[PDB]
RNA sequence: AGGACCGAACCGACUAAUGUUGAAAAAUUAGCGGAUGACUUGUGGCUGGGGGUGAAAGGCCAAUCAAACCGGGAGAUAGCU
RNA sequence: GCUCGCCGGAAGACCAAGGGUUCCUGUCCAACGUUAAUCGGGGCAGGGUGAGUCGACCCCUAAGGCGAGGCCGAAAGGCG
RNA sequence: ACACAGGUGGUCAGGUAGAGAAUACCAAGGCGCUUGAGAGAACUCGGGUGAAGGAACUAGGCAAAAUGGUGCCGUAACUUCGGGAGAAGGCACGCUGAUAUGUAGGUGAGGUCCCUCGCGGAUGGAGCUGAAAUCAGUCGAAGAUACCAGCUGGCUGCAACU
RNA sequence: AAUUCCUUGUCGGGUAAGUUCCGACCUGCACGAAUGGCGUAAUGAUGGCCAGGCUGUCUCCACCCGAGACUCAGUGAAAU
RNA sequence: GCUCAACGGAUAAAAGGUACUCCGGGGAUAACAGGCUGAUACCGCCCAAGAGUUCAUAUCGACGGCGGUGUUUGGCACCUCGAUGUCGGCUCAUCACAUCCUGGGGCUGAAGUAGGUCCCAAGGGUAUGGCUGUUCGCCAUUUAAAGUGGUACGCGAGCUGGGUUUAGAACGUCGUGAGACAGUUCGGUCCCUAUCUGCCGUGGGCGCUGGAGAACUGAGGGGGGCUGCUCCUAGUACGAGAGGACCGGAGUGGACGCAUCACUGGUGUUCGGGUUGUCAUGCCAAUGGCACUGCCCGGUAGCUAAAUGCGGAAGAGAUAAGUGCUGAAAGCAUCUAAGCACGAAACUUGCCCCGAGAUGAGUUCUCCCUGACCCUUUAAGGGUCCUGAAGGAACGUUGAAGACGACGACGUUGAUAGGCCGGGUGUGUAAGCGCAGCGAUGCGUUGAGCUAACCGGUACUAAUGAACCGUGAGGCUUAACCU
């Protein structure tokens, strides 16, 4: 249940080795407005692929 | 059928309600109900029957609510659980006349007499 | 396990799921474009699109069925008068889902579900 | 008429499960007992520590009881750690 | 704003205790709120509580308390 | 100690079903309980339903399952004559129509008569309300249809009992 | 026997099988008449046993429905 | 002048209970467990008086003897009293062999059947109930058998608390009494969110020497090893009869394990219907909410078992107790010494699963990259520009894969999901209208209407073109081969 000896900062780092965030690595650029968006996502001005899908 | 199972009696000499104290045949056999032989106590008996209350002797299950499965997939289910009383040493029918339906699964060895006496097979 | 099974529980009971899908389908018929989380939109397709396939045929029993589902007579009237002729030649896919940005309160994958031939 | 009967409020606490770093320093959820009386509850008051009170259990006397709590003797004493 | 669900001998409404400004309006979101907060019982100002009839006060007692004198007790004090 | 699943005296008490302040659904009125979004492993908690057997489980029927309401039959051993006794066992329950354009019963406007002639009485006798029963029909597998609502009997120890 | 060590005494009974139970016998280690003796209808959230109904208690587990557990965002302890 | 006799004399003068207990210490000192020992206990061997008709050893073994195990009662007090939970049951095991069954043998006072005793052998298997808290034990009925021991008398950070083992109460006995019992009876709180090792599953990084995609070899490791009954041989052998083959065959089961859902069912809160009470959509009708899914009645997919298929083998190698052949030592003799042949569920293979992180990192097939410059502290390097290959990764639609990663299918050269069309299934003749009926209701339209997770089709909706990672011919020494 409880630890019997205190874990080291080395063991803390080895456990946290996989708690490293993943970057997006690719941001899609829309044709009719060259603003960047998440791929398969709207452009935050309202465009998907070449068309203004949402007015807001 | 199982242990602590009450059964009706098909044959006349066997009397009324009987209970399965042991499922004979097998080391840890739990459930046996088609042509199997089970050790039987007589929990309640009429005096016209030859056997009496508190007596242990064998029986063979003839009717089961679970029912037999035929080779083509047919399931004959008989309402009620029934047994034909048999002697402990001989495993031969005590009752002279068998009552109710019987199955063709009871066609082996001493059960030929049971299907011979019983009307509907 | 979940093998060849359909429907999303969405962490609610069946009465709440039916109530949300009725209210949601009414909102989609009224506004024709709504913002909802992406799993809820995917399950919304299966409740809105049968109503339009009902509404392609206009009869008293069909109006009663589309009232028994969604329990809103204005949604029934819109489904049978305005939509239906809007989607009569169309063979399915009346609702279209566009994934949008994550919700600020909790990181939920969000989307916009809309009727396909919306004017604007 | 009934320290009568079934049963809500109300009073209590028989069994079980959960909780047991709890939602809670004894509760929750199903069932349980009593429920016109030796019943219950509000507001005041009275009884004070080798004393009170007790349909009695070493029970209760402010989450404390085989002699409450607070200050003083007091830096008691400790052949023990 | 439109639907949905819950309580409805209450999770509705009012007196008493108890709290003491938590009520209302405006502004802000550092800290508190087991999250975000534009919101708040949070911060900061400013308002608001109007009685011959409602309570208190008051007049009168109960259990009981105090109790001039008095009886008693080493003193404190006990009883009346 | 907390924006704590606890504790906290009194007042009011709508409709329908119902004996009811139970319970169910709702009025008036107030709330969704100050973290959410997904997936739908084990395992845990709270439930529903299970072939055949049925207490073989277990320290023990612990727990679940079961019975449950009204009316009417009936109903013991012992007894302290009260009991035991809802003993046990059971049957009828829905809707429609007729009896009866809604009956038994309740309540009582007019008219009339009498009188202390007015908050008077008398066959006052229209409306309103109205339960139960009998007969016949009719639906379902099922009519206490939900919530609610008892498991029953026998032998013994102890304590009379509340 | 709420008491009997030996002891699971012995007879009758209940179960296929009964160190439990009931009626007892009397060989009472070590009952006994207000420290009451013995019976007793009713009553008991009392002790022991049997039976019927009933069933996931069990054979022997299976599916489904919700709250956790798993993943993502925010806040973020503990004993040791 | 002292039985100050506890005699170096606490004072003239002093008994007990504590389970209501509290405090300071101790493993200086008992209870559990471990540890030493093994008297006792269990097992084995030695001598053989004898019982066995005679015959010590078929089987038992007198009086005595010698060991082995740690295995019961003990001995000790080494360890923990600044805490190692107590029997039993449940769940899950694992080992030894002093073997209960099954396997192989020897002797038999072994005719057969069935036995006794001893040797080899641990692969697998090795009951359910009545009683009681019970391990036990006794009993009922099975079975091939219902093994004996170790594992903190296995297992309470896994479960239980029936028992001893607190606090309430009573009975019997003891004591004047408080109370006590190596007696009885009733009741009596069982905490933990897993750091490390360990296991069970599933992944990231890097390595394996250019980088990829696949198929493998198998070094190792794991699983699985049970057995009954009926018949044929055969009423044969054997036998005074009664009875009756423990070779070789075939079928059918019990238990166990794996897979699957075609059947038989179970569930199926996401399908259909009945129906109680109430509320609502104005109302009639039709519906929806709520009451455990309100209560039910059926039920598709999926999962499942009780349903269905299959398997534990045959064979080969080397063996164990045992049985031998040839054969000297020791002219005979002898299973062994030289040789040689048999021989079991044990061992190694054979069957099934993982498996090259097998750092000993293996093999085979295929794919893809062959441009310059600058500096340099040159087995070697660093940088710049151009170039990004096969492929992976990401993103999206998703799955009979899944906790998450992972794995698989698809991405407009598209059937990957939802929708749509048709069918199947399931429920049971919808709404509305008409007719009959005083009405409830019935009849027709109508096996109607709804219908899921299923089957077959269909781009209607979403799977955008990019972008990212990965590069630009791969070290140094030595051999057949050619300059």
UniProtKB/TrEMBL annotation, chain A:
Membrane-spanning intervals of the chain: none
Keywords from the named record: Ribonucleoprotein, Ribosomal protein
Classification via InterPro entries: Ribosomal_bL32, Ribosomal_bL32_bact, Ribosomal_zn-bd
GO annotation, cellular component aspect: large ribosomal subunit
GO molecular function terms attached to this record: structural constituent of ribosome
Protein's GO biological process: translation
Region (Disordered): 1-37
Superkingdom to which the source organism belongs: Bacteria
Family: Belongs to the bacterial ribosomal protein bL32 family.
Annotated PANTHER family: 50S RIBOSOMAL PROTEIN L32 (PTHR35534), LARGE RIBOSOMAL SUBUNIT PROTEIN BL32 (PTHR35534:SF1)
NCBIfam families, A to Z: rpmF_bact
The protein's name in its UniProt record: Large ribosomal subunit protein bL32
Automatic annotation (TrEMBL), chain B:
PROSITE patterns referenced in this protein's UniProt entry, alphabetically: RIBOSOMAL_L14 (PS00049)
A Gene Ontology biological process term: translation
SUPFAM superfamilies xref list: Ribosomal protein L14
Cross-referenced InterPro entries: Ribosomal_uL14 (IPR000218), Ribosomal_uL14_bac-type (IPR005745), Ribosomal_uL14_CS (IPR019972), Ribosomal_uL14_sf (IPR036853)
Any one annotated GO CC term: cytosolic large ribosomal subunit
A GO molecular-function annotation: structural constituent of ribosome
Family annotation (SMART domains): Ribosomal_L14
CDD domains xref list: Ribosomal_uL14
Matches recorded under Gene3D superfamilies: Ribosomal protein L14
Keywords: Ribonucleoprotein, Ribosomal protein, RNA-binding, rRNA-binding
Pfam families with a match to the protein in the record: Ribosomal_L14 (PF00238)
UniProt KW Ribonucleoprotein keyword: yes
Function: Binds to 23S rRNA. Forms part of two intersubunit bridges in the 70S ribosome.
Similarity remark: Belongs to the universal ribosomal protein uL14 family.
Complex formation: Part of the 50S ribosomal subunit. Forms a cluster with proteins L3 and L19. In the 70S ribosome, L14 and L19 interact and together make contacts with the 16S rRNA in bridges B5 and B8.
Protein name according to UniProt: Large ribosomal subunit protein uL14
Organism the protein comes from: Escherichia coli
Encoding gene (name): rplN
TrEMBL record, chain C:
GO CC annotations on file: cytosolic large ribosomal subunit
GO biological process, one term: translation
Residues involved in Mg(2+) binding: 3
Keyword Iron attributed: no
Statement: the UniProt record of this protein carries the keyword Kinase: no
Xref: Pfam families: Ribosomal_L17 (PF01196)
Family in the record: Belongs to the bacterial ribosomal protein bL17 family.
Protein name: Large ribosomal subunit protein bL17
